[PDB]
Amino acid sequence: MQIFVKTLTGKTITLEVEPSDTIENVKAKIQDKEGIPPDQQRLIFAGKQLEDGRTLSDYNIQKESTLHLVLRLRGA
Amino acid sequence: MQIFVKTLTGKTITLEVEPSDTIENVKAKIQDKEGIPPDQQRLIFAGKQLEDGRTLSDYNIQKESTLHLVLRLRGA
Amino acid sequence: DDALYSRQRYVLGDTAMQKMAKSHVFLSGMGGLGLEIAKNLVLAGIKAVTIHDTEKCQAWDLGTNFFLSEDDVVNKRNRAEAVLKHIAELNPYVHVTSSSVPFNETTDLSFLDKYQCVVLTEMKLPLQKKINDFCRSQCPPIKFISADVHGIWSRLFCDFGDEFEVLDTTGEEPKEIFISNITQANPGIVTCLENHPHKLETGQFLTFREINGMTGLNGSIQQITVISPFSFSIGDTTELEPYLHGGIAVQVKTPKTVFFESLERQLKHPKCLIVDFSNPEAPLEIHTAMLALDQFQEKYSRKPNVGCQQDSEELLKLATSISETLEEKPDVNADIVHWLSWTAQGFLSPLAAAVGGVASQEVLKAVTGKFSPLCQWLYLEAADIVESLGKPECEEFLPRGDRYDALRACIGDTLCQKLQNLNIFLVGCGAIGCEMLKNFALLGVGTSKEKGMITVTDPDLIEKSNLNRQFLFRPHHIQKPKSYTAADATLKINSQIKIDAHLNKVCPTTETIYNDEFYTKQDVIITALDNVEARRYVDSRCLANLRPLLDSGTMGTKGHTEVIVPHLTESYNSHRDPPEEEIPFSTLKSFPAAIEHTIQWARDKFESSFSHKPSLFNKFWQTYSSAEEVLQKIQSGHSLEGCFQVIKLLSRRPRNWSQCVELARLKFEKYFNHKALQLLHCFPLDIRLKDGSLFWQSPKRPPSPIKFDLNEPLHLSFLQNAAKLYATVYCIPFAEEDLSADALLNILSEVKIQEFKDERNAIFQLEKAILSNEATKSDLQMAVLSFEKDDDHNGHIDFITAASNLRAKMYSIEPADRFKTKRIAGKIIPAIATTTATVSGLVALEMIKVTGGYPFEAYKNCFLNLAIPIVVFTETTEVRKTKIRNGISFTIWDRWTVHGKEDFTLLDFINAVKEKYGIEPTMVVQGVKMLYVPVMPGHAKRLKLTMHKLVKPTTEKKYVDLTVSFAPDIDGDEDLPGPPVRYYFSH
Amino acid sequence: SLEEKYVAVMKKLQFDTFEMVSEDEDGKLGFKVNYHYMSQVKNANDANSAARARRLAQEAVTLSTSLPLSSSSSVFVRCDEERLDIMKVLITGPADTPYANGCFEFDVYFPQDYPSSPPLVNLETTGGHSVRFNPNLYNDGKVCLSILNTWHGRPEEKWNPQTSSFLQVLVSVQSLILVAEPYFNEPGYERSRGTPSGTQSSREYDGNIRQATVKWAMLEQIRNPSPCFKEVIHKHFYLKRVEIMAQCEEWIADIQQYSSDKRVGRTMSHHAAALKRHTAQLREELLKLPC
Ligand SMILES: O=P(O)(O)O[C@H]1[C@H](OP(=O)(O)O)[C@@H](OP(=O)(O)O)[C@H](OP(=O)(O)O)[C@@H](OP(=O)(O)O)[C@H]1OP(=O)(O)O
Ligand SMILES: *P(=O)(O)OC[C@H]1O[C@@H](n2cnc3c(N)ncnc32)[C@H](O)[C@@H]1O
């Protein structure tokens, strides 16, 4: 089951996941190629942020769907 | 004669050894208990890292003592 | 001048800055939207800007324009002329002109070719079509932009001709990778170093250099095909030599060509941009409804009347007719049409502000081509406000004859009345703060005489560079409190505003004045801070008072908005932030590989040499009055802290200018000559490792000693700055003429340079200084400096740049200019007005969502990056459920209470907790000061102590809050966290 | 038998607390003892951190009993009576090392965000920043360990809040840095292991280290013991006086055997003279030591 994530600044990543896979492992499999801590990244899908512990079936995430990664800012 | 052990993950392993047990043996022996590679199998008892050829009573260690694990060095 | 565009240069660049000059842009229509876009564009600093309006000022416009006043309304001036004076006050470097030439179908468009971009506001659609057709046919084509706002709806359109060229897709700097292995295969393979994945995408371009073995690849360009995270594919390499080592690759950017459409062609299938994936189909319906409204306005030459049901039916029929005509034939949202009909003639300020910010950014994209422009439509709206309103009465939306008629038509009188009674608290008066104040003034927040009050605190004084982004101040306001200047500027806009301004800085120490009752009196808190620690502190403070909290942050073309509501959402501390990384110490000290390494090394050396040592010297010599006393104590063997360093510094104290010059020469020699020699001596070049790999392999780069030479401008600047700093630090006066190259050359003509290779010596030198009368009280004083980035004459930046370039040349790495090094050293945050304005609009928009007590679903959080450009909206985090044991659970909003007395003891507290909440704790700490831990010795008897004595509180506080924990159900586990408990000393 | 008495006595002084900072009515913090990070402690006035308290509370139970204790080497720890974010740790040089019966005090601070970040570690007994006792060490007391450094490296070589513990950090130090051949802790020179040049370099390094540690590890401590560890120091050295004297004489005999060399003769003679000078005073310092 193929899935894509597009973070800001135009970066798009290709991921392989399975529906019963839970969210903490979902965010874990991106660290092997990006290095960001799983607790350091926020993931968004169709306007609902993915809470820890659930799985893709909970959020009805299908093949070739697009999720995004976001970060907070500090400057003012 | 078993001896207690405290590893990095904190679990207290206590496995039967012999007074004549040489560390070459334990290098392979404890490998799969956590998958820890032999090079990363860096240990100390009496606060001192051990040597493969010597036996337990060579250092005059007692039964059911407790030693600890450490990992590979790397500098600044 | 960089003193005005320091921040802007980082965002744009020098070449884009040059293209920014010699620019002319035409504007039509100075409504609220036109006013704010002109303000933003003037803040940008375009050479020449032309504005136009044929209308006249009216009293109703006072609620939409913050520059108009009663006199202009009385005099019925043309809106183009009544403001032309004020806009010039922002930037004298900007030439501004007004016009009032009537516009119609037969008006000649030839004169418009003078400019290069045109933006239209409040214009009839067919004439816009004609203008776009004319402009797009120009050679070169002239950029066209259209935008409008009606009620709670806005429309964005763009056209840059059939073909456009962009010189930078993203603006993010290319990264650098190091080569671990290369395979002479068809196609070739290159392996990344251990760890550090290349993080690339197939199709990108790159260049190489400094390759051993495969030297023919140096200076060439390939296209990649990523295979693994640590490997990829390149062109055929079978024809070259074997890969020995080395090799540095960096991405090569490429310009991209985009395409557009005519307005009319886009009208049959607008290419909108999705900003919310919950309803991706909504923008098509919004476009259809906007088209139907335009058709109605054309047909009846008027806007629909609020509550006029027949107009609603006619507009719905028109929308049905248009929707089927569309290429895709979308559905019809009757609610959308009804709401648009209800508030067609309204006007909302924050939405206009955000639209203006994004439009100004698009204008910058048009004039520079720096970022990827939007293609080719955009629609923003805030229907959630009226979504929870149900079915209101049109009577509440009727105007009463005040400046708030438009907003009353937008939302209803009662909501506005609630806005005028709000006590709001704001922290920080940065760039976002001024926009906040402007929006509040336009919204009439807190204008009620009975109630409604604003509090702002900031210790900062006005700075020259800040005026580029902060508009509420003026150049003649330099070195003045920000709060009072901002308050006066806001009060000038609207007299009814009641503002409280402070110079205070929020921090744990000043918590006394900002006591809990102060927070409770306030209704909501807004943050505009630049550091995360203040965010955490304010969030923790407001958590104790259960008040809504709002936060936003910005950097360049990126920003984020967060909303916090008690009992419903999570806190800021519920999520972490990426901490700043630090390079391994050994790399900075010995083997730098990046320019920033040398920059930080120079900064740290400056700090050590000019702050730490003088401070230690002064502290040591204020500790001991008599130097002879110190010598006597040393001779008697008494240990003294830091004695050797300070005595070495004292023995090496210069006396005159030439001594300072010699000291600078010696320090230069040691810094940039001897270290390389010692490193080579300890580490030869050819030494290998156990695997045989050479010690001087990448990323490590062998250094090289470099000989002194006065002729070098780098040398000259370095020595001049060092001598000035030494003279200042030792408080020895000098003359500027001494800095002449000839005089310094004469000074250095007689100085030797040493070659390259305890208590008794220190005592001897101290006694020699004593007998030489070098131990006076004035000698036991030392100047201490502080780093300054805004001072253009202290030479700190010059010295740091010279040192960084010198150390870079030590390791033969490319140097950097003044401004890049200045930004890197100062951690300067690039910023621009467009993003700040847009995020301010978003915050103001959600402010009324907070005010109305809307349900959880209405609130949205926004993340955006105008560089792409891209905008995303989400629903905020729901508060999470946290259970402990026996089904007992709590959230972040929980806090338990205990009422004690004068003789209350610890066992009493423990038993009372066990009874009231059913479970007995195991640990108590007041903040970070621990009060009882059973593990620590002697804590058992602490159970029999008065809480007043054990705590020692302040008399003003009638209570205290403590941290608690409970034993886990199974041993070997962490104590289960619990909500903090507020103990009361009495009833 | 003597080692048994030593272990029994030192066991009771394994862990304890002390009063290091007091407050007036204004809340100002007065440091009764010398500390390295007083500025950071004063600046970090926020008590927002709470998970750190739970983590330290869980840790202290393990720290009360699990500390190593033997005649060869041991560790000691002191903490504040009220605060728990500050800690002084004393380490002794293990047996069969150039650090035999040394004494080394380290300042450790715990950041507010702990355990999200590794705690701060520094050495204070550096002889006034004069001596570099180890390739991974520095005159300022800083240390080269990637495990503490939060840099790219490896995921296994980072401070993982879920797994890494400060006690394991202490355990890492002894047989990894405090080794019998610290000159071979420097990368690149282990490549030349077995060559006579490396042997001579290691010998010179060892003599330098031995004289440095006899200077700044026993005499300085007995003359000016830190108040937190005065009694520990005195009770240690008093029960070890004869053994320490014998081993010192052994070192003095050992070093002079290379004075006949030419490549390192001058350094060896310098080290021998210094060591004899230190031992002369150390003898009487021992003889005057009360029980
Ligand atoms: O005080 P620091 O910033 O730590 O710099 C010191 C200092 O050099 P400066 O006085 O030029 O700053 C030492 O000299 P002294 O103050 O002790 O006389 C010098 O010692 P050397 O003269 O032996 O070079 C040492 O260099 P090193 O650590 O190589 O011994 C160097 O350290 P950095 O240049 O790395 O800061
Ligand atoms: P940018 O610098 O434009 O905006 C930040 C402004 O906030 C002020 N500020 C920072 N930190 C504080 C605290 N703790 N209290 C009050 N004001 C603060 C800066 O001075 C900027 O004006």
Write the layout of secondary structure elements.
The complex is a heterotetramer, with two copies of chain A (76 residues), one copy of chain C (987 residues) and one copy of chain D (291 residues).
Chain A (H helix, E strand, L loop, with lengths): L1 E5 L5 E5 L6 H6 L2 H4 L7 E4 L2 E2 L6 H4 L6 E5 L6
Parallel strand pairs in A: 1-5
Antiparallel strand pairs in A: 1-2, 3-4, 3-5
Chain C lengths: L1 H11 L1 H7 L3 E5 L3 H13 L3 E3 L19 H6 L3 H4 L1 H7 L4 E3 L19 E4 L4 H12 L6 E8 L2 E7 L3 E4 L9 E8 L5 E4 L12 E3 L3 E2 L8 E3 L1 E4 L2 E3 L11 E2 L1 E4 L4 E4 L3 H5 L14 H19 L8 H17 L8 H9 L6 H20 L8 E2 L5 H4 L17 H7 L1 H7 L3 E5 L3 H13 L9 E5 L24 H12 L5 E4 L13 H6 L2 E4 L4 H12 L5 E7 L2 E7 L20 H5 L5 H29 L3 H9 L7 H9 L5 H26 L30 H17 L11 H8 L10 H13 L24 H15 L7 H9 L6 H19 L9 E5 L4 E5 L7 E4 L2 E3 L5 E4 L6 H11 L6 E4 L2 E4 L14 H5 L7 E8 L9 E2 L3 E4 L3
Parallel strand pairs in C: 1-2, 1-4, 2-3, 4-5, 19-20, 19-22, 20-21, 22-23, 29-34
Antiparallel strand pairs in C: 5-6, 6-18, 7-17, 8-9, 8-16, 9-14, 10-12, 10-16, 11-15, 13-14, 23-24, 24-25, 25-26, 27-28, 30-31, 30-32, 32-33, 32-34
Helix pairs in contact in C: 3-12, 9-10, 9-11, 10-11, 12-30, 14-15, 16-17, 16-30, 21-28, 22-27, 23-27, 24-25, 25-28
Chain D lengths: L1 H11 L2 E4 L2 E3 L5 E3 L6 H6 L7 H15 L9 E6 L5 E6 L12 E6 L10 E4 L42 H12 L18 H28 L6 H10 L1 H16 L8 H23 L4
Parallel strand pairs in D: 1-4
Antiparallel strand pairs in D: 2-3, 4-5, 5-6, 6-7
Helix pairs in contact in D: 5-8, 7-8
Family (chain D): Belongs to the BIRC6 family.
Subcellular location (chain D): Golgi apparatus, trans-Golgi network membrane; Endosome; Cytoplasm, Cytoskeleton, Spindle pole; Cytoplasm, Cytoskeleton, Microtubule organizing center, Centrosome
Protein name (chain D): Dual E2 ubiquitin-conjugating enzyme/E3 ubiquitin-protein ligase BIRC6
Q: What oligomeric arrangement do these chains adopt?
A: heterotetramer
Major sheet of chain A, described briefly?
5 strands, mixed
Strand order of the largest sheet of chain A: 2-1-5-3-4
Q: Identify the bound ligands.
A: inositol hexakisphosphate, adenosine monophosphate
Strand count, sense and barrel status of the largest sheet of chain C are: 8 strands, mixed
Tell me the β content of chain C: 5-15%
Note the gap between the termini of chain A.
42 Å
Instruction: Provide the helix percentage of chain A.
Output: 10-25%
C-alpha end-to-end distance of chain C: 65 Å
Catalytic activity (chain C): ATP + ubiquitin + [E1 ubiquitin-activating enzyme]-L-cysteine = AMP + diphosphate + S-ubiquitinyl-[E1 ubiquitin-activating enzyme]-L-cysteine
Subunit structure (chain C): Forms a thioester with UBD in cells stimulated with tumor necrosis factor-alpha (TNFa) and interferon-gamma (IFNg).
Binding site for Mg(2+) 1 (chain C): 460, 463
Active site (chain C): 586 (glycyl thioester intermediate)
